[model samples]
Target: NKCDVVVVGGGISGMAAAKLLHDSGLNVVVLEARDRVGGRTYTLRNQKVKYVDLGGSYVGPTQNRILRLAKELGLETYKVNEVERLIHHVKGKSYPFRGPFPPVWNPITYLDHNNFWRTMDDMGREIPSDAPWKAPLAEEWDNMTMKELLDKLCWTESAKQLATLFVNLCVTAETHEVSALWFLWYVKQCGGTTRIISTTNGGQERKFVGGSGQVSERIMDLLGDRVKLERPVIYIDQTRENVLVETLNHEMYEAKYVISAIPPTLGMKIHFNPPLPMMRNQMITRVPLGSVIKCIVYYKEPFWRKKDYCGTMIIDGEEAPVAYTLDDTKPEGNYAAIMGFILAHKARKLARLTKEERLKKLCELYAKVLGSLEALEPVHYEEKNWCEEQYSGGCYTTYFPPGILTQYGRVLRQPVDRIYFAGTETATHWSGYMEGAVEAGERAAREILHAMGKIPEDEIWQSEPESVDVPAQPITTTFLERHLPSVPGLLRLI
Candidate 1:
């Protein structure tokens, strides 16, 4: 097959790129390794429930591209329920708190926590969204891990642990595994820590009516036969004028340009005629995706809501199997469930255990936390260990370690000869979410369009609007906010 462009991977990013290229009247073909589309966004439907998003579910403020795409696809979205209190488990004790932060009795710990976030936000502001390596403190920050920064800044053990929890929840990786520069850059790209963690008016604010996976599925529908499933590209030889893409079955695709939209690590699996640039190879080698098992336990009803709990819990214990959880009940009040993330080292360790063992342990923990035996008897349970996924390798997105960002970050999106890269990792904004995937895919498509003189150079780096017409309730003050401490003051400081 010969086309103007060949896009690798069938994930949201690749599909987004292919869609744009095709719409622009370019002959584009998408070769996907997986039998299905959506990539990281997998939606599961069963007899027990209408639909459950096993991956990349939530979208909130600042994630504009995804919101716009959802609206364009005729999908509806609803705000996640968070009218009740949220639980904070520390040292085996559960304390209910309102708003984003957990309650701290000690003044020093509170001060440390406040100062830590303030400093992180302040430092993050200095980082340029598209070029984090060019930040003033790039070398200093990129050379250290988040753990190192926490060690130097945090005064209390409680504050340090809380910081670790936030990092683990957000990135699905240990603090020590992520570079300080990369962490700050990531937060900056997603707006900030408050927006990233908050449920109301934040990242977890809203969910699609059915599932986020529909975004790519819809694109695939529009693309029709242009998309080839289960056709993984085994080798790419761009020595000639047109790049030659060969699949595992030896099927060939010749294109003027190629977009490699899979994760950087997965890209290493492909054989290039002339190997990737040294820096690009090094960056991909170092940028590893975080480990996580997104588990959903179904129930007869939203049991925790009856107890005045919003179904949000942050467990701050090293031995805790699940790090965080949220109410996974549908807006129409059907298929009630609580979603939990078995993250980082816990995910790796728990992966060794049988599903039955993991499920039992999670149920027992939920039973204890929610103070109900009903938690133990779930109607249905589903879990996806992203680490074990043959195509994904891991989930959320990839991150830099101590030194990779500054040393080789520039080559992340740089096109090598006729090959262009497009993925969430290559995005400048909302880099780990669906928005980033769409942004990167469109950006890569624009690059090809510009090269073909189909679009102006300035249009290649266009920004997406921050607001979309998804029906979300206005942000208003509620009892949860009034009863809680002055969150506005803390946010002001942040």
Candidate 2:
């Protein structure tokens, strides 16, 4: 056998799992389809720009899996400047506000914000992190789409768009794409909806000094040449003694065990000799990867900041091609920048357009939000359309559709013969973040280690993830209302 275990995907999860297995005295080899490691998370350091994260970025608060790894690798991390002034674009008007809630354009929009927050809060407590599919009314939730929920609440126009905005911003999916149960599980996985979206104290708070991809690079550095690049696995066969993996270039590998750390949808692209189970195949087919085009625009300075805005803008509806924007400026001189995200159908449509067209749309979007023509004259433009990437299929994460979660979600992490699964989608916490990838990787490694009797079951999760102390004050709706109140009548009831 060429190795004891062949880990597929050179992303963070596969690398972490391989490193752990290698340290446990197992012969491990990493196979990556891309020419480089860091699958979905890569630092787009081009020309004079070094800190641009073209993929997954930001880590904060309770997410300690990636933090521990970064610290262990002697990586420096810094908190991002919080959004002080939030601007909302609805229908043809833009309003500036401060707080969690948006400007109440109407009574329906106000009710939508309060009701959405309350419903999510209620669901967060009721849905358990590990077994959300087993929750009360799970079948009903699974059978319903996020759009269905909004319709039930009578949310229309601006309210409906605002309700769907978070889904696009988080999962890069439309409201109708994911089941309510799947979304609840996603929120539960990240601790809460607020935990995932909050900029100040939530998951979008901190970032590595160099780039998020540095963590993967450092792990690869430690592994030496055990990692193979541009090795796209096309076929796999599991025998009684060994599992054979064949790459696109006809390169074959024999190993005792194999771990496929790619997205479940991408896993469908590979052929299994004996074939996967019906439920597994259904899951792979049902859960499609979300669309995303991460666009970063660099400027001469933080121009939006000068206007008393933090560059955090959420444009409602399809008025602008981008649904969300954020400040991604570095500390260097004349290095101010902002990131605009085109998600779901918008991303798919924009992807078909020429690069110049997309850039023009982004410039128009930013110019409207910043209320300045200066946004049109960016020093540089960097964009990555994950949908166009052959190996990725899509970006951010994949989500289950209505009725799919309760039907086939249990098979996501279950192993089949010698083939195992590992990815952010399989993660129990922070799924879709770099931390989730690391957690999933470490978990897969430990599982394989335990299966081989290299580690004891009791030792699993014995080490608490290294992390900073959380805020002593409780994060509550009342606290949100008192501290960062949105519109007068809106969010107050939440």
Candidate 3:
């Protein structure tokens, strides 16, 4: 089949780009390996009562891409169940704290955590998301691992633990595994480390009405027959005139351009006929995806609400399997559920365990953190180890090791002939979030449009089309800004 564009990977990124191109009168076809769309933005349902977002779920303030797109799809927004306090369990003890500060009474630990965040906030400003190597100190930072940064500070054991946990929380990878420059650059895209970690005015603040997956589903719905599922792209051959993509079933597709919107890891699966640039090949191999085992516990009602608990918990010590838990209760009805993610080394170890064993560990941990025996006897429990899932080997996102970004980051979005790149990992802001995926998709669509002379290159700088021009663009005030005051950090950007 011949088309204007053949989009590989029917995830949010591919669908977003395909939708735009199709709307602009370009013939586009989306190929997805899975039986469904959405990619990492998977949303699951337990019977008719509960909704479980096993993949990317939340969107925060300033995430204009997904927010605006949702409104265009006629989807509503809602806040996450807010909690008065978070139970920080460390070294077999639980301490209650409000805000970002943990109740670490020790001066060494308190200052350690404080300085760690302060350093991230300070350094994040220097690294640009699109070009990390452009930072003045890029070489120095890129040459060092995140662990090296802490070691230079003579970090206390307490400091090291919190540092490792927080970094893992952000990228779902360990601190020592990533480059300092890469970490700083990613934090910049996330609007800063404070914004990524905060619950209010932060990344975890809000969720979509139906489920985040519906965003991609709705886009595919509009695309209609153009999107094809269960079609795994096995090979791609690009020529000066056109690009040919071969699927597992031996189906062939030829297009003027191809958008590879899959994750960097999954992109490596396809066999490039002439092979990619050496740097592009090495970049994908070096940037490893992070591990995550997502689990959900469903109950009869918002039981935690009775205790005035918001259902947020941060379990400490390497002994605990669950890294974090959130109150995922939706306002649709009596459905109440707590979603948790076991990330990094812990998730790796737990992913190999049997379902009964995994559930046992989760129930025991939930008993301690949720502070109720009822949590152990939840009527329904579901889990997905992304590492075990085909097509998606990991969850959250991928990260670069020391020196990789400064050395090869530029090749990420660079096109080879008619092949272009579009994914959350290739985004400048809000990387690893659904918003970044949308932005990347929009960017890819605009790039193609410019190449075809449908839109001028000068108009590309506007970020997106005028809201009224794009029906899916969101047009609403942030709940916080509309009702109350705003954060100084976020205010500085606005």
Candidate 4:
């Protein structure tokens, strides 16, 4: 009934905190609301694909914490295939292009597109990851919505729509719903716009061999029975000496400190004896989880690849349910599939329809882009509507609305007496991703350790190495690189 620390929410964050505290010779127990341990990172098993991740699926450069953990656990990963052309479906037409973005034939829109991201990257660089509210234009930026910024920066409607689509996909929320300051800070934390969007060296670059959820499961195995599933902590009474954590089922545990690794909004559900500070309460109330329905459509073969298409698509049409998609096929090419995200407003609207109805609509959209009926004949389909989950109201991670970050951002990670907050939302780097979750968990654990005088104050912000040892692969020269010089010679012969 007593321990050194009680970590509520057995997601990657809570599990990571418990692992560190236990490794440091502290008696740590983890309480998870869900029956499973992974929280937002759920891996579903399918007959065709074997393993498919429905949440928090990708990892790439700059997400060092999660990548390091994966390496430590001996989990294999492979780069997502992006050698073929990417399709950008806009205005009811599909434009296939190479690299991060489609070619903007119109010069004005092209200039606007380049300028928009340049403005974002430039503004983002000024915001400090640890304290975004302290930025020079924090007040001005916080008061404005991303939509307002988009209107100001983008000249053409095409450029504006593309920017909006990017924001919708990244945050899983509407452009107007998110604060400009928060969006810029988020982009900065993940490196930049290019790094966040690219597939080869970007956030969607690589995926775990089995599933991303296995990282949390492996960590739970190390923690063993200390991790209690379906034991949601409903109440916490923190006194001067120790903290009392009470579960919904009335089980109680006394500990020196408590680490709440749940989302800000979910944290508000837990009753604090003294009641949380006004600023913390206000901050938690304003931050809400983003809405998303991650769906995967499977086929007998990689149909899009046959047409020289990489399975990545960005749809800017209002009628389309999915805003973005990526190749979800296994590295070995066994499961030919494409993962699509029905995000923000579209996600809310589509949730009204039955699963079959949604699948049909999505398949139709795919068929339009691929120019083939094979997209309609998918052998299998899987989806997870994170908004429907009771424990996690939504997925990816929480975001700030206009003005909240400037007013109450300081209390996000600040501890209340013996209670500490740890979650992806509290993280400074890669916030909203698994890397941020692990970093926040470890940081919170170190805070408790510092309080106990087990560690110094300076050790609280532990740094992770940027690079990890990845499995080696032989490099192959691209066709263009090998033959570009011969083009001039062939033209001369003509």
Measured by lDDT, the strongest candidate is 1
The digit string of per-residue lDDT tens for model 4 on 1-494 reads 98999999989899889989999999999999888989999998867769999999998877888888878878878888797999988888888999876788775565567677767888998899999999999999999999999988777788889899889989998899999999999998888787888787678889999999999899998988999988988999975467999999889999989998998889877988888888887777888899999999999998899899989998887899997889998898879998999999888999999989989998999999878899999889899999998888898889899999999888888899888989999998889999899999999999999999999999999877666543222223345433432222444668
**Deviation in Å, model 3, residue 95 alpha carbon:** 1.7
Global local distance difference test of model 4: 0.87
Pairs that clash in candidate 3? 68-474, 72-472, 189-430
**How do the candidates rank by TM-score, highest first?**
1, 4, 2, 3
lDDT of 2 at 375: 91
For TM-score, candidate 3 versus 4, the one ahead is 4
Candidates in order, TM-scores: namely: 0.94, 0.93, 0.91, 0.94
Worst 10-residue lDDT window for candidate 3 reads: 468-477
lDDT of 1 by residue, 11-54 (tens): 98999999889888999999999899999999998888789999
lDDT of 3 by residue, 200-219 (tens): 76778788777888998999
**Candidate 1 structure, TM-score to reference:** 0.94
lDDT of 2 at 140: 91
lDDT (CA) per prediction: 0.88, 0.81, 0.79, 0.87
Instruction: Give candidate 1 regions above 4 Å deviation.
Output: 470-494
lDDT tens per residue, model 2, 1-494: 39999999999899888988888788898989998899998897766676688998888878787888888888877766555688888766678888656767465555556666667767767777767788898999989998898777534455566778887788889888899888878887887766777777788777788898888898889888888898999999875478999998789999988888998888887998888888887778887888999998888888888788888888877768887787888745346888888889988787888887888888888888779998999888888998887888788988888999888888988998888788988888888878888888888778777788878987544344547533312356665433442333344576
Screening candidate 4 with a backbone cut-off below 3 angstroms (N, C-alpha, C), the clashing residue pairs are: none
